[PDB]
């Protein structure tokens, strides 16, 4: 039911899955996607309520700073436009 | 091996309450790495606290910090509410009896004003003595358009 | 118990704060709200005398500096019949 | 009905309703108006017998000034004119 | 859900700013749009507590550099049912 | 409630104007007027403890100068059933 | 019991306060509420020696400041049967 | 009554003094005595807000000099519904 | 919601009033009040993550001073199912 | 066009003249005049974002001296669909 | 069935036990109950007429200071209330 | 799994936080809570030896700076068959 | 086993020989080989955390000299079910 996006950029899939597992061990969110951007760039996209998303991304950032090539970015869009849902794949 | 690794996965979040109580277990304030919560980081928030003073300390300057320190009670700032001018059910004063032992803190849902506290117990309240309301009617005189009612009048 | 508590403050922010304090710290009934004009906002609650007293204590407590602050809190213990059209 | 007019004006209606309580507690006076002047001024009209209105206004001017910002303007009217009645709700 | 956020400001322009920040920040439906009088204007939104906090942050820093800015900014955690007529 | 508030005066006119303040300030019903003898007059009001306290406060603050003045005005929130024969 | 405890005071309010302290201070039954005249009011309690002693001491030193004040406080332990007309 | 009068002390001689003073002062129904652990004894009574306040005031004034003494002279006016299962 | 808020303190008064803070702040239900032993008493509620955060902070913000005050107050967003028998 | 423009000023002289500047400056339809209160008057216009932007600029530099001055000005391209009741 | 209630606090079971013994020896008063408060606190609760309770409590307080940890609290209730009776085995 | 893990701490807050760390670091099942007394609390967990080790160190890292803090933490790879019927 | 072990490197030659080390070092079943992109290759294996650690360390120690070397060797002993759709 959550609409807020919590999502992580990582160079390397190791910090990507570590971030995703931090997402699911931090707060009640479901990952809507795992995307291979290219050149080691990988994102994890999770949906949920604003507080749960914020806590999850907090844990993911605190976990992925040093793993592999390292964390690239964390961002917490909380209310995407109705047209942005197709951009995340639905 | 002679090469000591450094720790990680520090899940517990040691934040600090609005009145400096060590709160623990995650935190949803401002992180040095996350993006998107930057807006409104150093803005006053009257009411139920949700952002830590650690966030203010490491993202905002000192005046915001001690303004938050002053602000953000929960429901009971206790007896700081001295004058109600509503016939004052009050604690004794002019009438004896219940006046006995009228100095201890109720430390909860307030009932009596601090002015009655002073007029009964010579000391100021053992709870918040600075008496937020207190002045109430007394301040008056040049209140007129106090605060900022656009000063149209 | 029809003891009438009421408070007035600048801006309806502390007004609704202390109205929540009313209904959140004592078993009183919110008979209504009123917008005086020029930023003046009042709230009118009804209940038991001691309950209404504690309620307005808490309301003035939570209203004191937030926003533009409280103007006048008050408790009347036995309102009259003639006051009902005025409330 | 007693045409004797009492009216009390205050800043904010907390002192206005304190004055109204003094009215309805003192003497045989019926509040005929509770109006908001504008910009915070609140004033109350009661009507009744001359002595009754006088005593009521006395009680209001005794119990109104020290309530919040307090009383701003009170008076009595003894024998109000017929042409004023349209301005009194007609 | 029923968690109430609300912002007071001076005039309508920062009020519209605050409402726009409410709607672009988080999942909140604005439920109240009050012209208090004397310049005070208030916006009332409902939603989830954290969503309410994020919206309030965005509004607070979205309506202070515009015009003469806000004067008040509050977050109800849960409005008591007695407050429903006020909304 | 079950509280009984008491007022004492030098003479009965201050006592019963205090009783008027009692029954007109808060939701308290007076059960008795008693002429002690030698001018001492007491009035006994019955009602809620907070209401009784507020009413007694109002009456005492009203009646210092009325007549020759007050004597005693203290309350017990729970007078014994054994006091009822004295009531 | 056969022990009689009993007190005067000036004013009925301190008298009933003292009798109230009588009836909760110790297990005792009160038998007399006498208006002496001129303001003296006498309270007569009946019970065993220890209960009446403790109750009278408590009521007296609680009623000293109440109202106008007490009159006398000494108590007899084993009254003679001949005090029957005092009933 | 819904309001809660509710205290700890160390060792329960002051606990019974608190409860006794509860009864002496105002009408509160003793809903629970509890041994917290390590010697903390908590007393819990229900009654009117003003009655609870007066009773708790008396209990605090009467229990602190005896034994180890008082811990908290604390009162809740609205025990919310979810608190009741803990009572 | 299945987020868990949770506090520990010294005695029953801080725990009970912090439970009041929970049940008046956010959509949380008191799932448990446990006597740890030696005086430690803990309160356990379930609600929404942000709601849980706001509620528990309000509870600590109230309980720092009641009695001898707070000791511990931690927050978990998602409790693991295998922990649930401990609830 | 759904783009929004709206400005605030003290007194209706600058309000109407700036609305005139807007309607000579770009394809904008004056959808609202609002006497906000306390001398505040606000004008609301629909239009295309470039047009309404040029119009809000024209209104801004129209009354630097007209009346007693501006209060605020800005642009909204996409208000939320649910802000229409606020419009 | 004297309603007067004496009750004594002791740190440790010893002083409570000889407190009860002294209660019984000083006067023919009845004990209503001993309680383990917790944390080493043990409490004795006796009933009787007011004077006998006073004498017994005085004797126990005299006899318990030296033995063990000694007294913690000691006081006399002359008229326990009906509302306190449910705390005594309702 | 047959390997046993013990987490001891001061208070139930760090206890269940460490329990979450247990069940949320590795494949382990807690078999029990137990309040030792005086505030000491233990959680008993079972599972695979390496799973027990990872979980127990995770709880150790988690618990020292939560509330009053950790006290003890241990691993038993083979609990004897005489130990479980007194688990 | 359900715990995850996994290896990342540049070029899958070190990846596959490290996977050989995985499956010759401890009883672990590999679930996937994935081309991350830009030469980044990862291998994902099941196992119990003891076997996971042994195998993952074996692959890391046998993998650095081959090709471009490691990028990250990581283990998680408690993988969530919710993570599986990403696997």
GROMACS .gro file of N, CA, C and O in nm, chain G residues 13-55:
model
  172
  607UNK      N    1  -1.849   2.509   6.159
  607UNK     CA    2  -1.760   2.450   6.059
  607UNK      C    3  -1.643   2.377   6.125
  607UNK      O    4  -1.621   2.259   6.093
  608UNK      N    5  -1.566   2.438   6.216
  608UNK     CA    6  -1.461   2.361   6.284
  608UNK      C    7  -1.517   2.244   6.362
  608UNK      O    8  -1.450   2.141   6.374
  609UNK      N    9  -1.638   2.257   6.416
  609UNK     CA   10  -1.697   2.147   6.491
  609UNK      C   11  -1.718   2.025   6.403
  609UNK      O   12  -1.682   1.913   6.441
  610UNK      N   13  -1.777   2.044   6.286
  610UNK     CA   14  -1.800   1.929   6.200
  610UNK      C   15  -1.670   1.878   6.142
  610UNK      O   16  -1.655   1.758   6.119
  611UNK      N   17  -1.571   1.966   6.120
  611UNK     CA   18  -1.440   1.917   6.077
  611UNK      C   19  -1.379   1.827   6.184
  611UNK      O   20  -1.324   1.720   6.155
  612UNK      N   21  -1.389   1.869   6.310
  612UNK     CA   22  -1.335   1.790   6.420
  612UNK      C   23  -1.408   1.657   6.432
  612UNK      O   24  -1.345   1.553   6.452
  613UNK      N   25  -1.541   1.658   6.419
  613UNK     CA   26  -1.617   1.533   6.427
  613UNK      C   27  -1.585   1.442   6.309
  613UNK      O   28  -1.587   1.319   6.321
  614UNK      N   29  -1.557   1.502   6.193
  614UNK     CA   30  -1.518   1.425   6.076
  614UNK      C   31  -1.385   1.355   6.101
  614UNK      O   32  -1.368   1.235   6.070
  615UNK      N   33  -1.289   1.428   6.158
  615UNK     CA   34  -1.164   1.367   6.199
  615UNK      C   35  -1.186   1.264   6.309
  615UNK      O   36  -1.111   1.167   6.320
  616UNK      N   37  -1.288   1.284   6.393
  616UNK     CA   38  -1.324   1.184   6.492
  616UNK      C   39  -1.360   1.053   6.422
  616UNK      O   40  -1.304   0.947   6.453
  617UNK      N   41  -1.452   1.061   6.327
  617UNK     CA   42  -1.512   0.942   6.269
  617UNK      C   43  -1.423   0.870   6.169
  617UNK      O   44  -1.449   0.754   6.139
  618UNK      N   45  -1.319   0.935   6.116
  618UNK     CA   46  -1.220   0.855   6.044
  618UNK      C   47  -1.090   0.829   6.121
  618UNK      O   48  -1.020   0.734   6.085
  619UNK      N   49  -1.057   0.907   6.222
  619UNK     CA   50  -0.931   0.887   6.292
  619UNK      C   51  -0.924   0.753   6.364
  619UNK      O   52  -0.820   0.686   6.359
  620UNK      N   53  -1.032   0.712   6.429
  620UNK     CA   54  -1.036   0.585   6.499
  620UNK      C   55  -1.180   0.534   6.499
  620UNK      O   56  -1.274   0.610   6.476
  621UNK      N   57  -1.195   0.405   6.523
  621UNK     CA   58  -1.327   0.344   6.530
  621UNK      C   59  -1.401   0.405   6.648
  621UNK      O   60  -1.368   0.380   6.763
  622UNK      N   61  -1.502   0.487   6.618
  622UNK     CA   62  -1.576   0.558   6.721
  622UNK      C   63  -1.713   0.594   6.667
  622UNK      O   64  -1.730   0.618   6.547
  623UNK      N   65  -1.812   0.595   6.755
  623UNK     CA   66  -1.946   0.641   6.722
  623UNK      C   67  -1.969   0.775   6.791
  623UNK      O   68  -1.936   0.791   6.909
  624UNK      N   69  -2.021   0.872   6.717
  624UNK     CA   70  -2.049   1.003   6.772
  624UNK      C   71  -2.196   1.012   6.811
  624UNK      O   72  -2.283   0.964   6.738
  625UNK      N   73  -2.222   1.072   6.926
  625UNK     CA   74  -2.355   1.070   6.986
  625UNK      C   75  -2.413   1.209   7.007
  625UNK      O   76  -2.534   1.220   7.028
  626UNK      N   77  -2.332   1.315   7.002
  626UNK     CA   78  -2.385   1.446   7.036
  626UNK      C   79  -2.339   1.560   6.948
  626UNK      O   80  -2.219   1.576   6.924
  627UNK      N   81  -2.435   1.640   6.901
  627UNK     CA   82  -2.407   1.758   6.820
  627UNK      C   83  -2.485   1.875   6.881
  627UNK      O   84  -2.595   1.908   6.837
  628UNK      N   85  -2.427   1.938   6.983
  628UNK     CA   86  -2.502   2.028   7.070
  628UNK      C   87  -2.463   2.172   7.041
  628UNK      O   88  -2.344   2.205   7.031
  629UNK      N   89  -2.564   2.258   7.028
  629UNK     CA   90  -2.543   2.401   7.008
  629UNK      C   91  -2.552   2.468   7.145
  629UNK      O   92  -2.660   2.484   7.201
  630UNK      N   93  -2.436   2.507   7.200
  630UNK     CA   94  -2.433   2.563   7.334
  630UNK      C   95  -2.504   2.697   7.338
  630UNK      O   96  -2.573   2.731   7.435
  631UNK      N   97  -2.488   2.777   7.233
  631UNK     CA   98  -2.540   2.912   7.232
  631UNK      C   99  -2.428   3.012   7.236
  631UNK      O  100  -2.328   2.993   7.306
  632UNK      N  101  -2.441   3.120   7.159
  632UNK     CA  102  -2.333   3.216   7.151
  632UNK      C  103  -2.216   3.172   7.066
  632UNK      O  104  -2.114   3.241   7.064
  633UNK      N  105  -2.228   3.060   6.996
  633UNK     CA  106  -2.126   3.014   6.905
  633UNK      C  107  -2.051   2.890   6.947
  633UNK      O  108  -1.980   2.831   6.864
  634UNK      N  109  -2.063   2.847   7.072
  634UNK     CA  110  -1.998   2.725   7.115
  634UNK      C  111  -2.075   2.605   7.062
  634UNK      O  112  -2.196   2.593   7.083
  635UNK      N  113  -2.005   2.516   6.991
  635UNK     CA  114  -2.065   2.393   6.940
  635UNK      C  115  -1.986   2.276   6.995
  635UNK      O  116  -1.862   2.276   6.989
  636UNK      N  117  -2.056   2.177   7.048
  636UNK     CA  118  -1.995   2.064   7.116
  636UNK      C  119  -2.023   1.935   7.041
  636UNK      O  120  -2.136   1.910   6.997
  637UNK      N  121  -1.919   1.854   7.027
  637UNK     CA  122  -1.924   1.723   6.963
  637UNK      C  123  -1.895   1.617   7.068
  637UNK      O  124  -1.802   1.631   7.148
  638UNK      N  125  -1.978   1.513   7.069
  638UNK     CA  126  -1.975   1.405   7.167
  638UNK      C  127  -1.960   1.273   7.093
  638UNK      O  128  -2.051   1.232   7.020
  639UNK      N  129  -1.846   1.206   7.113
  639UNK     CA  130  -1.817   1.078   7.051
  639UNK      C  131  -1.806   0.972   7.159
  639UNK      O  132  -1.765   1.000   7.273
  640UNK      N  133  -1.841   0.849   7.123
  640UNK     CA  134  -1.845   0.736   7.215
  640UNK      C  135  -1.762   0.621   7.160
  640UNK      O  136  -1.779   0.582   7.044
  641UNK      N  137  -1.674   0.567   7.243
  641UNK     CA  138  -1.592   0.455   7.201
  641UNK      C  139  -1.497   0.413   7.312
  641UNK      O  140  -1.505   0.463   7.424
  642UNK      N  141  -1.408   0.321   7.277
  642UNK     CA  142  -1.313   0.271   7.375
  642UNK      C  143  -1.201   0.372   7.396
  642UNK      O  144  -1.180   0.463   7.315
  643UNK      N  145  -1.126   0.354   7.505
  643UNK     CA  146  -1.036   0.458   7.553
  643UNK      C  147  -0.927   0.492   7.451
  643UNK      O  148  -0.900   0.610   7.425
  644UNK      N  149  -0.864   0.391   7.392
  644UNK     CA  150  -0.756   0.418   7.298
  644UNK      C  151  -0.807   0.487   7.173
  644UNK      O  152  -0.747   0.585   7.125
  645UNK      N  153  -0.917   0.436   7.118
  645UNK     CA  154  -0.972   0.495   6.996
  645UNK      C  155  -1.014   0.639   7.019
  645UNK      O  156  -0.981   0.727   6.939
  646UNK      N  157  -1.086   0.666   7.128
  646UNK     CA  158  -1.131   0.802   7.154
  646UNK      C  159  -1.012   0.893   7.179
  646UNK      O  160  -1.009   1.007   7.131
  647UNK      N  161  -0.912   0.844   7.251
  647UNK     CA  162  -0.795   0.927   7.279
  647UNK      C  163  -0.725   0.967   7.150
  647UNK      O  164  -0.700   1.086   7.125
  648UNK      N  165  -0.694   0.869   7.065
  648UNK     CA  166  -0.625   0.899   6.940
  648UNK      C  167  -0.711   0.988   6.850
  648UNK      O  168  -0.661   1.084   6.791
  649UNK      N  169  -0.841   0.957   6.840
  649UNK     CA  170  -0.928   1.034   6.754
  649UNK      C  171  -0.937   1.179   6.799
  649UNK      O  172  -0.929   1.271   6.717
   0.00000   0.00000   0.00000
